Amino acid sequence: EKSVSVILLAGMPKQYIPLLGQPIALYSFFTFSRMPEVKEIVVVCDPFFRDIFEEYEESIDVDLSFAIPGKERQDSVYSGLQEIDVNSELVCIHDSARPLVNTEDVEKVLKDGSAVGAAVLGVPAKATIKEVNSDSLVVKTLDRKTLWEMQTPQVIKPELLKKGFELVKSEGLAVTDDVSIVEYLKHPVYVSQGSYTNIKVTTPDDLLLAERILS
Amino acid sequence: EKSVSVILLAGMPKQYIPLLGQPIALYSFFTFSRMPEVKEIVVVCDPFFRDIFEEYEESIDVDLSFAIPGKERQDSVYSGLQEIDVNSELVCIHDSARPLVNTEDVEKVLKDGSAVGAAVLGVPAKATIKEVNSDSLVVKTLDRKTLWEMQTPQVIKPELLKKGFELVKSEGLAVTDDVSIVEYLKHPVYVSQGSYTNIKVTTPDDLLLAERILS
Numbered sequence: 260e261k262s263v264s265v266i267l268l269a270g271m272p273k274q275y276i277p278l279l280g281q282p283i284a285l286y287s288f289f290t291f292s293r294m295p296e297v298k299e300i301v302v303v304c305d306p307f308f309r310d311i312f313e314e315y316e317e318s319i320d321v322d323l324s325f326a327i328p329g330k331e332r333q334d335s336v337y338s339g340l341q342e343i344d345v346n347s348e349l350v351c352i353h354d355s356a357r358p359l360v361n362t363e364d365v366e367k368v369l370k371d372g373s374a375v376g377a378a379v380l381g382v383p384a385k386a387t388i389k390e391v392n393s394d395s396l397v398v399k400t401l402d403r404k405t406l407w408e409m410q411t412p413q414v415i416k417p418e419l420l421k422k423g424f425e426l427v428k429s430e431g432l433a434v435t436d437d438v439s440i441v442e443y444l445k446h447p448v449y450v451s452q453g454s455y456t457n458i459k460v461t462t463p464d465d466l467l468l469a470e471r472i473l474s
Numbered sequence: 475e476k477s478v479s480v481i482l483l484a485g486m487p488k489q490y491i492p493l494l495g496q497p498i499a500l501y502s503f504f505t506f507s508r509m510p511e512v513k514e515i516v517v518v519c520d521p522f523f524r525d526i527f528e529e530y531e532e533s534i535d536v537d538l539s540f541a542i543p544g545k546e547r548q549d550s551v552y553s554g555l556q557e558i559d560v561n562s563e564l565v566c567i568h569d570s571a572r573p574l575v576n577t578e579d580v581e582k583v584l585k586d587g588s589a590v591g592a593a594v595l596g597v598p599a600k601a602t603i604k605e606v607n608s609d610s611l612v613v614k615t616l617d618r619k620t621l622w623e624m625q626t627p628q629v630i631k632p633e634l635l636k637k638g639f640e641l642v643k644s645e646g647l648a649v650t651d652d653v654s655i656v657e658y659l660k661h662p663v664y665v666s667q668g669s670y671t672n673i674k675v676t677t678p679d680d681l682l683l684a685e686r687i688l689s
């Protein structure tokens with residue numbers, strides 16, 4: 260209990276558009292707040308939108324903190340990381356554009372993060388996805404490989420994430436997707452099987468789909 | 475001109491639900507029919523739905539043929555393959571659940587199919603997608619690889635596709651995704667860059683999205 264620090268990434272933005280009267284960002288916010296494992300939520304957002312979360316501070320059973328967003332997603336993660344409780348055993352990074360994450364799936368990725376050191380929610384990729392080289396040719400592999408689409412939460416022990424940022428900074432390495440920093444480390448990353456309902460709200464068509472799932 | 479045979483895969487089914495009053499399957503059907511390169515369309519469908527396509531035979535400037543569907547998608551491809559003109563230089567396989575394919579993108583993949591021998595429409599995968607091993611761990615690769623989501627058409631020289639089917643049959647090989655048969659061959663497969671609008675209609679949420687794009 261109260262071992263986990265959540266970093267909620269929320270930096271006309273899509274994550275503040277209402278679903279059934281509630282801004283998208285508040286759905287995951289409340290899901291995390293109800294979990295006894297969660298001690299605190301560090302919301303990374305433009306100071307303009309702080310009131311959206313601040314309104315519920317005494318109602319929720321977590322500490323609320325804020326951090327300023329950065330230029331890219333990993334900079335926002337780093338900013339949030341500076342505000343967590345010094346004794347938190349686990350950091351739980353979530354895209355606020357994913358409002359429909361199930362408590363049960365958060366529980367799973369928290370467990371796996373604790374066990375392995377780093378874990379992320381994923382689902383099997385349904386489409387035919389292939390590696391393509393610089394001459395636009397399919398890179399053929401009869402060595403079979405199952406591909407998974409990553410979601411959030413991404414759950415990691417704070418010291419491991421900090422070492423990841425330190426390595427990328429010191430050596431000046433390229434950050435290209437949402438698990439690139441840990442990919443440079445030798446520490447394993449577990450993929451916790453999530454739900455296809457945990458969609459990211461990018462456009463008004465997702466905005467619509469999110470609302471159906473809520474029904 | 476008239477060098478291409480289209481195999482249109484259409485076997486309460488999703489591909490016969492109307493978009494703006496026209497069954498989904500007819501959209502790609504008509505797109506192909508207007509192209510001078512296309513000589514014929516072999517529709518693979520349950521005999522029950524033949525009338526949907528048969529209604530327009532004298533109106534369209536292509537030959538119309540039919541083939542019975544098989545158990546899996548590759549069996550339907552094989553059935554359609556048996557009906558093409560004996561002198562067709564190119565077979566153009568299309569999922570009828572993709573009604574929004576642009577003529578310009580069909581032209582591109584036809585060109586690339588002719589040049590390379592095998593080509594497929596694709597777009598860069600937007601999500602973070604990773605290989606995951608049997609212990610549910612991310613298979614790390616600092617050797618960077620750009621992943622692409624495959625669409626249709628899949629365009630191939632008939633003799634190459636036939637050799638692919640012959641190899642899979644003779645050796646009893648596993649067909650696991652929509653490009654597995656050519657993956658066993660040494661012949662290259664080109665990925666022609668398509669459009670994100672060329673979506674597959676799997677559910678009523680796609681059914682809705684397809685209709686927006688049409689507006």
Ligand SMILES: Oc1c(Cc2ccccc2)c(Cl)nc2ncnn12
Nearest residue numbers: 352378413414415437438439440441
């Ligand atoms: O490596 C990371 C992590 C860390 C992490 C934690 C758990 C599983 C997998 C990756 C995060 Cl939160 N954000 C990131 N953005 C780019 N890279 N990158």
Ligand SMILES: Oc1c(Cc2ccccc2)c(Cl)nc2ncnn12
Nearest residue numbers: 567593628629630652653654655656
């Ligand atoms: O290999 C294939 C092809 C052939 C092809 C043609 C052009 C590009 C890539 C693959 C087709 Cl149409 N369908 C398939 N279903 C399973 N495998 N498989």
Ligand SMILES: [K+]
Nearest residue numbers: 459461462465
């Ligand atoms: K989307």
Ligand SMILES: [K+]
Nearest residue numbers: 674676677680
């Ligand atoms: K879909």
